[PDB]
Design an enzyme around this catalytic site. Structure first.
Site, PDB file in Angstrom:
ATOM      1  N   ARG A 158      33.079  33.852  45.079  1.00  0.00           N
ATOM      2  CA  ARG A 158      33.507  33.103  46.253  1.00  0.00           C
ATOM      3  C   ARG A 158      34.744  33.700  46.911  1.00  0.00           C
ATOM      4  O   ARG A 158      35.197  33.176  47.935  1.00  0.00           O
ATOM      5  CB  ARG A 158      33.758  31.634  45.898  1.00  0.00           C
ATOM      6  CG  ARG A 158      34.997  31.363  45.059  1.00  0.00           C
ATOM      7  CD  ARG A 158      35.108  29.875  44.728  1.00  0.00           C
ATOM      8  NE  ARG A 158      36.297  29.566  43.942  1.00  0.00           N
ATOM      9  CZ  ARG A 158      36.510  29.949  42.688  1.00  0.00           C
ATOM     10  NH1 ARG A 158      35.577  30.573  41.987  1.00  0.00           N
ATOM     11  NH2 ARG A 158      37.682  29.685  42.119  1.00  0.00           N
ATOM     12  N   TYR A 159      35.279  34.799  46.371  1.00  0.00           N
ATOM     13  CA  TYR A 159      36.496  35.407  46.885  1.00  0.00           C
ATOM     14  C   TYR A 159      36.308  36.813  47.434  1.00  0.00           C
ATOM     15  O   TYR A 159      37.213  37.315  48.110  1.00  0.00           O
ATOM     16  CB  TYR A 159      37.569  35.453  45.789  1.00  0.00           C
ATOM     17  CG  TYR A 159      38.015  34.086  45.336  1.00  0.00           C
ATOM     18  CD1 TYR A 159      38.438  33.135  46.254  1.00  0.00           C
ATOM     19  CD2 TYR A 159      38.001  33.743  43.993  1.00  0.00           C
ATOM     20  CE1 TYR A 159      38.844  31.882  45.843  1.00  0.00           C
ATOM     21  CE2 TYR A 159      38.404  32.495  43.572  1.00  0.00           C
ATOM     22  CZ  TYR A 159      38.823  31.566  44.502  1.00  0.00           C
ATOM     23  OH  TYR A 159      39.222  30.320  44.078  1.00  0.00           O
ATOM     24  N   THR A 160      35.181  37.463  47.169  1.00  0.00           N
ATOM     25  CA  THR A 160      34.924  38.814  47.645  1.00  0.00           C
ATOM     26  C   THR A 160      33.903  38.794  48.777  1.00  0.00           C
ATOM     27  O   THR A 160      33.137  37.839  48.941  1.00  0.00           O
ATOM     28  CB  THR A 160      34.433  39.709  46.500  1.00  0.00           C
ATOM     29  OG1 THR A 160      33.254  39.137  45.922  1.00  0.00           O
ATOM     30  CG2 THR A 160      35.502  39.825  45.425  1.00  0.00           C
TER      31      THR A 160
END
Lengths: 487, 487
Positions: free
Chosen positions: A89-91
């Site tokens: 969910r962060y890349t």
């Protein structure tokens, strides 16, 4: 668990890249969250709650892992020190430009598709790749190292020009591996053996220099580049271990000065020691030098097989012959389908007055259709375009002989009548009218060029050569790993 | 993690149901694999490799958890004995019929949408539900029990007839909770306390009866129904544990005979014991009786609030007032834009001969468009239909006054010209001619009905009443839980 020799991929790689392809996750469009792609793969191809999908995405985006990255990633995708990638969910990711060459002409029935787990989705069995991806990005049972793309394309071109080329003739273009992490290969003997038999051992050595301070005379070892698949932090931990345990002598200090502008391991030498003797001992005791056992094994139509360099290049070119032939068959059928339609439209627009009159008089569109096909139509001022000295190459293969131009008239099919019924009024303006007629004349030239390719092996190989040189122009880069003629 | 008072949903519930809606995973279409839906939710709305999404799907499909299931599930989804559902690759799901009532008119700008986690998708802030889902399915900090749909609809209708209705008046229609597992509520004191203040304690008690043999005189306890949220296997393990530790006496046998014909737990009583004493002993030491603390907390105007029964019903009716108002606004603008287009088409099909000639002599579609607007057109045989719309009401709210009918002549806008240029030849038939005429009449009727709704609060509440009586006809069913004075 073995890659296909033709595209260098395993099923798990193909699921990620195809999913990204169908999502429109293109190299020149905005990034998407990795979790978007991961969820499509879970829902359609790999319905488990494991992390294998994301791990596959992460390696594909690492410049220290792939010689030519297939994923363009944004964010924390890990490091040479073994740091983990951030959560999905962060890349952010999107296809690399070269991955589009991997999947070129996937929509043109160039490769077979298989069913997914529930029979509601399809997935390619192999990619229609223009990129010799097995040699270029490698695979690590099998242990194929990466290679420089320019050198491999040149080797492919050399094989296309002389199928009886020898291994030595290919190594004039392909001297050996080329790692994303650069460094040095000591010696050519293991390379020749591996390209000749599929098996051989090479030595990879770090790029390291011994400096001396101008005034004090003190020596420092600086490490610029390390061997492929070596963790930098683990390597430094090991050196420190050896120094503490007195297994390696002469070292007064050790630290990693690397930043985002390059690698820089600092190894300070005691005055009473010799920097080169310390460096040679480190080579012998640490992963500053490693051996890489080349073992070139891949799936050749489902069967594991040891393969030499010529085998691999030969299979990739054979793959290109099949892909281009199938592509050309597909474009030929698609061009004939469209030319068929355009003949009906040209005929409606030359007989526009009785066409409109026929339709207005019909109660329902279903019997305006039936009236159109019950009656032949004059060719009018478009007969020069359709007769062409008996040329019937633009006709679809499935079209029965009772349809088309006949006895100076045209006999419509039901779907041709439908096409006429679907025509918008804009198409009656002058420029839009000529635009349909110009499209048809281009299609006739296209169709003749497609038939030439299907009928001349020489012409098919000309097309492949052009694709190869274009790939070299777009994605070729410079060799990174030095191959010495020593040790 | 609080439910919205209007649709009874937490964010994770709403994300699952919206994703299934977007997939077309409808009650009357083929089942989809659970994994396919889970993957969509992870990718778009809830990006964690987690069981939260599939656990949510599983509960929504369990008839022992939900009084009116929102998910139609095929396969092993668990049981009242606490065994786990099979993995998401082995189960199939689609929206239940009542779930479509939760999401009716989502596409008609009835609710506010918010961004997803990465700002690439939109998701509704709340569902435009025709079902009073908070009360009817409940939410187990908050602890709201389920209710009978027929009763809750009737209470809503009584509130619409009299907003000054009292709790006691609402309780003529809604005597209390209604659990999917049936059984018995003991005592009305805690029900009224909860409905008046939002907090109260009720006691759920199993349906059990002592039967005695005619020829042997033996007594058997038969359990037909057990309290909501009680695991039947744990309960039987506890009864056995108490008999082995001698904390309960009089039991000679214990046997679960439940089948597809219903639940049936058998407890044979020793002849030295009295059946009624043993059963009373069980109610006191096992989950054959439990307490349920009603604590009706939900999100109201974005804030947590304790809410009594009238507060909840009023919030739902207020939600329906806003959704129907916004729906009517959307439908009215849509109906005026279609009537605008239909007028232009009707005048063109009447003056079809000069239209075709005008377009044929234009060299481009733009110059045919500038030629269509710049001259007026005769009303022809269609002039009766436009005068029926003598009320400038079918006219869109953005239209300037100089467009339309003027001195027996029609003046087209740019959009109206495009619609004519986009017209297909099949519209020149007869049955497709009149089809578009009738559609214009029906639109005028519909436009008037929508204008009446927006002008009259009384008529607005008439639509809502019919909707509510429809929901009662489609989904209302019989009460399962008996309510008794006390014991």
């Amino acid at each position: 668990a073995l890659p296909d020799v033709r595209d260098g991929l395993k099923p798990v790689h193909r699921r990620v890249l195809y999913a990204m392809n169908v999502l429109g996750n293109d190299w020149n469009k905005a990034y998407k969250k990795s979790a978007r792609v991961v969820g499509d793969v879970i829902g359609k191809y790999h319905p488990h709650g494991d992390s294998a999908v994301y791990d596959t995405i992460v390696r594909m985006a690492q410049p220290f892992s792939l010689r030519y990255m297939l994923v363009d990633g944004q964010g924390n995708f890990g490091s040479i020190d073994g740091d983990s990638a951030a959560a999905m969910r962060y890349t952010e990711i999107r296809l690399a430009k070269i991955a589009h060459g991997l999947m070129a002409d996937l929509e043109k029935e160039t490769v077979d598709f298989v069913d997914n787990y529930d029979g509601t989705e399809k997935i390619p069995d192999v990619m229609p790749t223009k990129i010799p991806n097995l040699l270029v990005n490698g695979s690590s049972a099998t242990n194929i190292p990466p290679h420089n793309l320019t050198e491999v394309i040149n080797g492919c071109l050399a094989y296309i020009d002389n199928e009886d080329i020898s291994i030595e003739g290919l190594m004039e273009h392909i001297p050996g591996p080329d790692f994303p992490t650069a460094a040095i290969i000591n010696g050519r003997r293991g390379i020749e053996e591996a390209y000749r038999t599929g098996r051989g051992k090479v030595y990879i050595r770090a790029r390291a220099e011994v400096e001396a301070d101008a005034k004090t005379g003190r020596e420092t070892i600086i490490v610029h580049e390390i061997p492929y698949q070596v963790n930098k932090a683990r390597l430094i931990e090991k050196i420190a271990e050896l120094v503490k345990d007195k297994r390696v002598e002469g070292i007064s200090a050790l630290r990693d000065e690397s930043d985002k502008d390059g690698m820089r391991i600092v190894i300070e030498v005691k005055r009473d020691a010799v920097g080169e003797v310390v460096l040679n001992n480190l080579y012998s005791q640490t992963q500053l030098q490693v051996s890489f056992g080349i073992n070139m094994v891949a799936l050749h139509h489902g069967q594991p097989k040891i393969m030499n360099l010529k085998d691999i290049i030969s299979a990739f070119v054979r793959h290109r012959r099949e892909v281009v032939t199938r592509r050309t068959i597909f474009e030929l059928r698609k061009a004939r389908d469209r030319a068929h339609i355009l003949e009906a439209l040209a005929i409606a627009l030359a007989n526009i007055d009785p066409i409109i009159e026929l339709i207005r008089r019909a109660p329902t569109p279903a019997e305006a259709k039936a009236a159109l096909i019950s009656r032949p139509w004059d060719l009018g001022n478009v007969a020069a375009m359709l007769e062409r000295a008996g040329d019937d190459a633009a006709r679809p293969e499935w079209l029965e002989p009772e349809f088309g131009v006949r006895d100076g008239q045209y006999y419509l099919t039901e779907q041709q009548a439908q096409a006429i019924l679907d025509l918008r009024l804009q198409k009656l303006t002058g420029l839009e009218h000529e635009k349909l007629l110009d499209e048809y004349k281009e299609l006739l030239e296209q169709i003749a060029e497609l038939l030439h390719i299907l009928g001349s092996a020489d012409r098919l190989m000309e097309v492949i050569r052009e694709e190869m040189e274009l790939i070299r122009d777009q994605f070729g880069d410079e060799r990174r790993t030095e191959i010495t003629a020593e040790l």
